[PDB]
């Protein structure tokens, strides 16, 4: 029986003396591991991106949760945030001016763009990986999310859920002003509300093998599109994918809202009461809750 590997990756940095983050990670990992089911030859690989102090914190938490109740094989891998930052920087430098808080190009921001260049960072043996926030609660077997890779149309490289607040309606204001008729920043079903980065299916092989995706990483393409859209942000990879998704929606397999049900309502109380519902609406059986902007998750 040849072993089949499944890969997840989570950012876990600055966790020491950060009780809220540790508590979120505990909720995420315990739910993940409690509900996961994998066949005997299968192995779940949990990648964490951490500096040395958070690595120690993560190990302490994981030993409390491993082995998993279901008894399948699980491997834990740590990646040094400082190593990854240096590998990322050449590729990611040009976009940081547009999508980082705030100005200009700082190493401390580079790691927020890991997903955009994940295909260049992870070993070649890894064809696919799902990057996950740690402020999630899983309501189903994570094995099921991997079948969404099967639904990628030719040319799609990344699976991602839409953003459930009007943050991009706000961000694309100028472009929306100059293009009254645009779908850019509008709510579903026919608008493009942008993406949320909490759950991302990164098909590393498809990303590597796409001429289009590779071009979009080039500094002049980043600049051209940022200029076209009058677009600035501070949410890192989320903003980049959101922007290239306006120009090239074919690159993205849009996940159903139930795979990343975002709970943050910050934008409702900051000017978008009228339209907020059209963005936030999600119905169906929820598979993953996402407590973004420090929003408590219900039970």
């Amino acid at each position: 029986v040849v072993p089949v590997d499944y890969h997840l990756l989570m950012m876990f940095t600055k966790a020491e003396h950060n009780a809220p983050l540790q508590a979120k990670a505990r909720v995420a990992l315990s739910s993940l591991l409690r509900l996961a089911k994998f066949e005997a030859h299968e192995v779940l690989n949990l990648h964490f991106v951490s500096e040395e102090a958070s690595r120690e914190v993560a190990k302490a938490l994981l030993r409390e949760l491993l082995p998993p109740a279901a008894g399948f094989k699980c491997k834990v891998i740590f990646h040094d945030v400082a190593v990854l930052t240096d590998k990322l920087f050449p590729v990611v430098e040009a976009m940081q001016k547009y999508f980082s808080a705030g100005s200009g190009t700082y190493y401390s921001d580079s790691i927020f763009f890991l997903s955009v260049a994940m295909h260049q960072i992870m070993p070649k043996e890894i064809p696919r990986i799902i990057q996950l926030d740690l402020d999630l609660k899983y309501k189903t077997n994570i094995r099921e999310l991997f079948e969404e890779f099967d639904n990628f149309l030719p040319g799609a490289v990344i699976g991602i859920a839409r953003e459930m607040q009007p943050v991009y309606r706000h961000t694309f204001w100028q472009f929306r002003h100059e293009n009254p008729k645009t779908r850019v920043g509008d709510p579903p079903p026919e608008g493009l509300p942008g993406f949320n980065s909490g759950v991302m299916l990164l098909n590393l092989e498809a990303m590597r093998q796409s001429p289009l995706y590779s071009h979009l990483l080039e500094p002049s393409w980043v600049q051209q599109l940022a200029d076209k859209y009058h677009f600035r942000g501070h949410l890192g990879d989320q903003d980049f994918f959101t922007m290239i998704g306006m120009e090239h929606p074919e690159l993205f397999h849009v996940l159903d809202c139930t795979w990343n049900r975002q709970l943050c309502t910050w934008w409702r109380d900051h000017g978008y009461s009228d339209v907020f519902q059209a963005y936030f609406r999600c119905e169906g059986h929820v598979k993953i809750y996402h407590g973004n902007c420090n929003t408590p998750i219900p039970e």
Binding site: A101, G102, H170, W173, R232, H234, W266
Partner: protein
Amino acid sequence: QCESNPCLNGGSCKDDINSYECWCPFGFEGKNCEL
């Protein structure tokens, strides 16, 4: 991190150094779009 700029113009972070005007979403007023 920074707090999102509540204004429609200027940088993505509130109190962007290179910004002077603040245009608020409809229904809101102030230098931070409060009332």
